[PDB]
Design a protein around this ligand. Sequence first.
Ligand SMILES: [K+]
Ligand SMILES: [K+]
Ligand SMILES: [K+]
Ligand SMILES: [Mg+2]
Ligand SMILES: [Mg+2]
Ligand SMILES: [Mg+2]
Ligand SMILES: [Mg+2]
Ligand SMILES: [Mg+2]
Ligand SMILES: [Mg+2]
Ligand SMILES: [Mg+2]
Ligand SMILES: [Mg+2]
Ligand SMILES: [Mg+2]
Ligand SMILES: [Mg+2]
Lengths: 107, 179, 95, 50, 47, 56, 50
Amino acid sequence: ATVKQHVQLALSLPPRLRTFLARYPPASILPAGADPETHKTPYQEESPNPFMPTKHPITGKWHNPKYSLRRQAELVKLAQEHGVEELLPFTRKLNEEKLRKRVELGL
Amino acid sequence: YHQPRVPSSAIPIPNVSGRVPLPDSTPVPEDFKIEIPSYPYGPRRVYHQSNTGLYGSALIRFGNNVSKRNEIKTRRKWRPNVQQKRLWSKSLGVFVRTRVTTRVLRTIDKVGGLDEYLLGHKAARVKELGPWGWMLRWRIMQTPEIRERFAKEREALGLPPREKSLEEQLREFQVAGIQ
Amino acid sequence: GLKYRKLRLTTKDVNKGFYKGNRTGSMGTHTSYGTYKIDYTKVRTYVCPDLTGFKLTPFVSKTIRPVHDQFPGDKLGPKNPATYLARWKSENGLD
Amino acid sequence: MDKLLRRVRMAEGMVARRAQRKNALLKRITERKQNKKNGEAFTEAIQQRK
Amino acid sequence: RNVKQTMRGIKHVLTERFYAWEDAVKLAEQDPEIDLSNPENPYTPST
Amino acid sequence: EEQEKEAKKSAAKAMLTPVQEYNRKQRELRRARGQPALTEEMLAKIGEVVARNKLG
Amino acid sequence: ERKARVAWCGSPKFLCIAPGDRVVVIEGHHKDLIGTIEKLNTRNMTVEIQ
RNA sequence: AUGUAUUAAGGAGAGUAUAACUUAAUUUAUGUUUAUGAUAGAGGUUAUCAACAUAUGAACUCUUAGAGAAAUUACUUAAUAAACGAAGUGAAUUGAAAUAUCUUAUUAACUUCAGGAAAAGAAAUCAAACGAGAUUCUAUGAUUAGUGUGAACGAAAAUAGAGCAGCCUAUUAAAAUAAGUAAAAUGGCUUUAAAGCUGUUUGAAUAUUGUGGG
Ligand SMILES: [K+]
Ligand SMILES: [K+]
Ligand SMILES: [K+]
Ligand SMILES: [Mg+2]
Ligand SMILES: [Mg+2]
Ligand SMILES: [Mg+2]
Ligand SMILES: [Mg+2]
Ligand SMILES: [Mg+2]
Ligand SMILES: [Mg+2]
Ligand SMILES: [Mg+2]
Ligand SMILES: [Mg+2]
Ligand SMILES: [Mg+2]
Ligand SMILES: [Mg+2]
């Protein structure tokens, strides 16, 4: 019963969130004995972290991040409303990264 | 312009208007035309002089003439440094005569020649070519050099090898005329 | 000239080479010396059949009341290509 | 063809829009002529009442 | 006016027959009981 | 008349450069992969995160 | 007006009075007169009593 | 006049049942309900004494093949106004109680191109040490900051409302992440000196392990 309720919470998220998690699933939600490097998603193979830029091996050019800094802030703000901020990859817009950087270094 | 005669190719360098008139010697079937693909960005609605040369992005610009003391404004114009040079094309092997600006002459030396200036695939260059630059781009694509160069770049990109070329159709009309 | 000048110009008003036809059809071609050669392939003839013995007149007696056709249940009653082909088989099978 | 039908539909609307402007103008001219013809019956009755 | 209504009716029935026959031909091409190829015997009553 | 326009609009496909043809060819292949799906096991693990960060 | 004149007997297209039936006048100088309808003008909705 | 909804090429010539509209100028059929409707008769010219819904025949000439003195010739199953939109070029009346900078005014107008809308659009954006999160429309912010001798001109952040949508695997097929480019000098535009647009002459760098713009 509890598992059926968990599946009803994941299917209640907005389509914008469910779409992102599908193509960039973190190791946390992958199977228990899963290996992070194996069964990678076709999107993950292009870039492990979509929010970070990715120098192309053949062309030696820094491809712009898949999600711009504006859109990274809309994912962090939309994920924090449904308590799914733990699944997004490292982002400078993360509320914990913003706070950690200040306390660590300061003004 | 008055373009030279391509050494080994019947096809002539296209006319400034886009037409490709074939000589009377070359036998041509009934109602056969050589059509160049339309220019993606279309002609230039102002300064039509730039539709017949390699002007890059330079147009005729209008401004004011400001007096020294009272600073009174009078309308004037700024014209690009348009010249007429004979640019060499390794693919064709002749001197393509065209009206080109001085800023585009520095772009031809920077990229390594006219052929390298016409084969650019970036969006900012196809806009700088213009209708006349898009006709020369189509012409060099018919040469065997560029055809043999593009076929070699498809083997490095893992593309299947790539029907009849335009120079073969004209070659098949000279043999059919004698039959 | 005040008002008549503003009407549509006709051939019964001016003569200095102004020509305008009545859409009577081209029956030939013009020659180089001002004559006309009638092409009888363009001339039209009227096919009137023999009316001797024909009993139908353009009127029907008012005793016979006007009645339409029912074609019950067939939306395209009079234009149904099925009732024209099926009706053909029974009546005229050869042609 | 689907593009040949739009041509017809467009023609059927252009003619019906012109037939309404003509019919309307005729309904107003015919009405204005009857009202003036009936008024002669109203005037005779008004003249006989006085 | 009555002579013009008979002339109009003649043009309505002839236009109706041309279109009805122009469609029966098409409908008769997909019929298994009609063979438009041979005109001598183009119809065979189904069993 | 339209078939002669779609062939005239796409008449510039014979003047494409190798990199222009490679990009387009890859685009067709990618659009066939589709979008990945979230299995019930993955959805069950996401529901735990939501309930843990909302109710406790 | 035709709908008002026929308001008491159906409508201009469903008239419920026919020639040959006796009627009684209820207006004018000759009120309470009784006669038989001879004609029935359906254009002006007027009736002739001989 | 405003609002709502729907729609996205317009006019003329001649002819014709003078409510009826195209030389067929009052075509021919279906279904339903018919006074408890809808909103046990007479009547085909002494007509259309039936509305709604769905089909259907016909629909001339010119604008509008070519030529020409539009509605003709000659041929043929030849066919698309205005306003609205973007860019280019760009005044003057007027105010300054004269007048040159300025204002009038990124105006009127013209020119090209395009669609039922167009344009714009998912930050090399704004903010200020907290953060916001594409574009468009309306008001406030604002006779404000500011500019200018003056007369006048005049933002943005933010707030509220209308709409809301994000993406590159774009729901219609596009990038191997952008070089004669960013930028500099100089001549102009815009403007507050920045940012932005630009003719001439020149001319970079390669990602928060701090490269590039603001
Ligand atoms: K003064
Ligand atoms: K001030
Ligand atoms: K500047
Ligand atoms: Mg005379
Ligand atoms: Mg005379
Ligand atoms: Mg003459
Ligand atoms: Mg013409
Ligand atoms: Mg014509
Ligand atoms: Mg405002
Ligand atoms: Mg970039
Ligand atoms: Mg610049
Ligand atoms: Mg700066
Ligand atoms: Mg800059």
